[PDB]
Design a protein around this ligand. Structure first.
Ligand SMILES: Cn1cc(-c2cc(C(=O)O)[nH]n2)cn1
Length: 340
């Protein structure tokens, strides 16, 4: 395989200590994905640490990574400080028949941060810092020239700049596209997957705001909001919290009847275990009136009933079933939850 450089997965066989083009010293493997691998490397020439994404030696992944490079370079062009919430691609090159994207070195992902809380969550004040940054990132992505749908927002794809600060960036535009082909695909990681995608409808940038709402509840509670074992379980768990989707959505949805039944009067209900629809209130999940998630924020700074009510209002607006009326990033940033 590839003069002995590749395994039977078309991944490059990483050897710690290896030196590339008399410039990069491979330190270690920090990441694996469907695209290939991510390694920590010291760039001798610029005297800095870098994350090198080594794409599999297979034309499908190489072609996809060429779109990824194009989108990252498109974002890099922009003369705005909002692009500093997106991972910086420094350059790319072909090496031993692998396309390599050289990124800035970031730190732990938000999933590592949740594991460090022992899955009990971070303060509302830290959740607020992360929410403000992520809404600015999505405001940037929805710049008309860009119109980029990330398509895979989740804690694992949000990384701290460094382990000491609250500063974060979005990584992994490997699954990303520009708005244009209004088509259905099976996309987003299941826990963070929007009702429109579950329902087989075409998607737009609002799917990233759905994911963000799920992420921010999980950051504070310590656990995924909607942890489906499959699509039916995923939709059932969404309906536990938010109730039955609007009829005008289900009437247009190719996969409506995978989860719902149309009754003789044209109203819809869940198909033939689960809490009844709308019984698992976000009010109760967040512990608005009971000192936060499992009561653990009882008498803490900036954890008032009014603080929780603002958070709950913002999340409910991000978890709108209707992608047309789902809150857009600018209006999220104007939300009273951010007024301190
Ligand atoms: C620590 N670190 C990981 C990364 C990184 C970037 C990506 C990506 O864009 O796909 N994946 N991992 C950067 N720094």
């Amino acid at each position: 395989y590839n003069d002995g450089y590749d395994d039977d997965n078309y991944d490059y066989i990483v050897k710690n200590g290896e030196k590339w083009m008399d410039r990069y010293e491979i330190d270690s493997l920090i990441g694996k994905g469907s695209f290939g691998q991510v390694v920590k490397a010291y760039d001798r020439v610029e005297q800095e640490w870098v994350a090198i994404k080594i794409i599999k030696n297979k034309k499908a992944f190489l072609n996809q990574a060429q779109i990824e490079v194009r989108l990252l370079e498109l974002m890099n062009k922009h003369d705005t400080e909002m692009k500093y919430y997106i991972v910086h691609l420094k350059r790319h090159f072909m090496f031993r028949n692998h396309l390599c994207l050289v990124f800035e070195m970031l730190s732990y992902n938000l999933y590592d941060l949740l594991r460090n809380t022992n899955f009990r969550g971070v303060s509302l004040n830290l959740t607020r810092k992360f929410a403000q940054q992520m809404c600015t990132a999505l405001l940037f992505l929805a710049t008309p020239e860009l119109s980029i749908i990330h398509c895979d927002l989740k804690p694992e794809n949000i990384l701290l700049c460094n382990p000491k600060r609250s500063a974060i960036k979005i990584v992994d535009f490997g699954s990303s596209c520009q708005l244009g082909q209004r088509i259905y695909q099976y996309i987003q990681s299941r826990f963070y997957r929007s009702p429109e995608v579950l329902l087989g409808m075409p998607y737009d940038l609002a799917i990233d705001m759905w994911s963000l709402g799920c992420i921010l509840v999980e950051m504070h509670t310590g656990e995924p909001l909607f942890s489906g074992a499959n699509e039916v379980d995923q939709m059932n768990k969404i309906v536990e919290v938010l109730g039955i989707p609007p009829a005008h959505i289900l009437d247009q949805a190719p996969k409506a009847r995978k989860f719902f039944e149309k009754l003789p009067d044209g109203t819809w209900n869940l198909k033939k275990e689960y809490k009844p629809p709308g019984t698992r209130k976000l009010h109760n999940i967040l512990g608005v009136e009971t000192g936060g998630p499992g009561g653990r924020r009882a008498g803490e700074s900036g954890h008032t009933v009014a603080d929780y009510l603002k958070f709950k209002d913002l999340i409910l607006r991000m978890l709108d079933y209707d992608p047309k009326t789902r809150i857009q990033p600018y209006y999220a940033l104007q939300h009273s939850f951010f007024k301190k």
